[PDB]
Amino acid sequence: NLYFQSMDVGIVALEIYFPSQYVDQAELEKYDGVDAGKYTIGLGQAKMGFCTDREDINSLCMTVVQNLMERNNLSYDCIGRLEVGTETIIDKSKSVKTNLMQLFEESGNTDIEGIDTTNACYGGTAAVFNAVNWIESSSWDGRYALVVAGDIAVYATGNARPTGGVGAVALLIGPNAPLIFERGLRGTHMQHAYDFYKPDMLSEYPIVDGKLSIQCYLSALDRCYSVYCKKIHAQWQKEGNDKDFTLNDFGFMIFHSPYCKLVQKSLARMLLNDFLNDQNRDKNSIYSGLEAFGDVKLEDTYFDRDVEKAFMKASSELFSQKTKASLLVSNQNGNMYTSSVYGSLASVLAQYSPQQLAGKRIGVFSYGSGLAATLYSLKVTQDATPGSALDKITASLCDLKSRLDSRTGVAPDVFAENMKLREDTHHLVNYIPQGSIDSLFEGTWYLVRVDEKHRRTYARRP
């Protein structure tokens, strides 16, 4: 109670990994023969990262883990919990976490709690919560928790294909952190839904109910925001503060980003929530011109274009200040599934100084289809001095745009053939990848071979 208060448990370090090639969305429009703007404006997407046959879920996760450890000058004996959130499943029993133990062998540190945890795009967040809970528990042994969220997002040909991507994020979690989980403020919602699911074991691709997935994302947002607000209101009331939480109480607001347009719609949806919750709508200058919508219900408006147009316009400045910068990775790389929202976090840390971040609340909406969601928040430390934790974490990401721009664009036809071959190779054993090793970023782990018994071997590109 005062024990938890001392700890300031949070994110101490954040490492992001994405492959060295992408397909350009304007080029993909031409290739797919669609009208100009359908992807770049309609979806709001510029470039989509993809993998050659040299990278898989294990190599992505090994890559981001080792890059974090080296960047941060960490011994492998300083990790007490290691866990993977993913929905890229290449083995139904053997966890990615057990594969990652290869990296820990030389240290002899094998007493490391955690395995893998999966529900669509939400597994990273699940692992984060497990890590925080563990640090705060009787079982914490003074060591860091390490969370890895990683995924390869690929869709069948059609209108979902432009919304894939690939990436991994590693989060080092411990006490006295610069980005502190705001205690007791997890607004969670889970529900039995078939919006997006992967029951077809013969294919890498999901079954997607596109329209239902949008409705589920938005209804989950409504519910999570309401639970989050109820929880903060109760804390505030104890402290003698009877005000209502609104978007202005977030300094930044980040989202799981399937594509940028939905995120812009989602911030507008949060404003609509604020609007409906304020009994003094018609006397607040923030809501000027929205009087025609005073009586609408959330459940009736998931696809109401009038409400949408009005609230996107009314939230444009809030979107620019709180959310637009967070979309760097999404716009330039696509949907990284479990790591997407953490890519949005990385994007904020990459583009704002410690002084611009100090003391701010970062709202985090994490969604996974099926469905599981939580809106939670982080509080940034007030220490923005040089050499501070906040300075180190921002300095660790300030080259993010430059890293993204160092990738190579690949023509849509070449990308398309990569996808086709990936399908064809999906169940294959006794094979050796043919993709370039040299084109991988420095320090990237890659697949060497899959043997006749499905066992995989990895090596590190120097």
Question: Which residues are identified as catalytic?
Answer: 87, 121, 256
Please list, in sequence order, all residues whose beta carbon lies within 8 angstroms of the beta carbon of residue 426, skipping any fewer than 6 positions away: 203, 204
- Which one of residues 40, 45, 67, 99 is an interface residue with a second copy (CB under 8 A)? 99
CA-nearest of 203, 120, 94, 150 to 422 is 203
What residue has token string 């054993």?
429
Please list, in sequence order, all residues whose beta carbon lies within 8 angstroms of the beta carbon of residue 4, skipping any fewer than 6 positions away: 136, 183
The interface partner of residue 189, options being a second copy, ligand COA, none and the CB cut-off 5 to 8 Å by kind, is a second copy
CB of 174 to a second copy, least distance (A): 14
CB of 324 to ligand COA, least distance (A): 16
- Which one of residues 14, 23, 65, 132 is an interface residue with a second copy (CB under 8 A)? 132
Residue 134 or 205: the one with the smaller Cβ distance to ligand COA is: 205
Residue 49 or 123: the one with the smaller Cβ distance to a second copy is: 123
The encoded tokens of residue 15 equal 């490492």
CB of 55 to a second copy, least distance (A): 17
CB of 124 to a second copy, least distance (A): 11
Applying CB under 8 A, does 256 fall inside the site for a second copy? Answer: no
Residues 172-201 that bind a second copy (CB under 8 A): 183-184, 186-194, 196-201
DSSP assignment of 258-303:
SSHHHHHHHHHHHHHHHHHH-TTGGG-GGGTT-GGGTT--GGG-TT
Residue 126 or 247: the one with the smaller Cβ distance to a second copy is: 126
| Contact of 122 with 367, CB cutoff 8 Å | yes
Applying CB under 8 A, does 414 fall inside the site for a second copy? Answer: no
| Contact of 251 with 322, CB cutoff 8 Å | yes
CB of 132 to a second copy, least distance (A): 7
Name the helix (H) or strand (E) containing 47: strand 47-49
Q: Is 125 flagged in the annotation as binding?
A: no
Applying CB under 8 A, does 233 fall inside the site for a second copy? Answer: no
Residues 215-234 that bind ligand COA (CB under 6 A): 217
The interface partner of residue 42, options being ligand COA, a second copy, none and the CB cut-off 5 to 8 Å by kind, is ligand COA
Q: Give the three-state DSSP class for 3.
A: helix
Applying CB under 6 A, does 41 fall inside the site for ligand COA? Answer: yes
Residues 344-373 that bind a second copy (CB under 8 A): 368-372
* Sign of the torsion angle spanned by Cα atoms 441, 444, 449, 451: negative
Binding mask 268-287 for ligand COA (x = CB under 6 A): --------------------
What distance in Å separates the CA atoms of residue 184 and residue 186, rounded to the nearest whole number?
6
Which residues on neighbouring strands pair with residue 363, listed in sequence order? 253, 377
Residue 43 or 450: the one with the smaller Cβ distance to ligand COA is: 43
Residue 182 sits at φ, ψ, to 5 deg, of: -80, 115
Name the helix (H) or strand (E) containing 84: strand 79-85
Applying CB under 8 A, does 139 fall inside the site for a second copy? Answer: yes
| Contact of 374 with 187, CB cutoff 8 Å | yes
Q: Rounded to an integer, what is the distance from CA 345 to the centroid of its chain?
A: 8
- Which one of residues 67, 213, 273, 366 is an interface residue with ligand COA (CB under 6 A)? 213
What distance in Å separates the CA atoms of residue 449 and residue 14, rounded to the nearest whole number?
30
Judged by the rule CB under 6 A, the positions of this chain that interact with ligand COA are 35, 37-38, 41-43, 159-160, 163, 196, 208, 210, 213-214, 217, 258-259, 261-262, 369
Q: Which residues are annotated as a binding site?
A: 35-38, 121, 159, 163, 213, 256, 261, 265, 335, 369
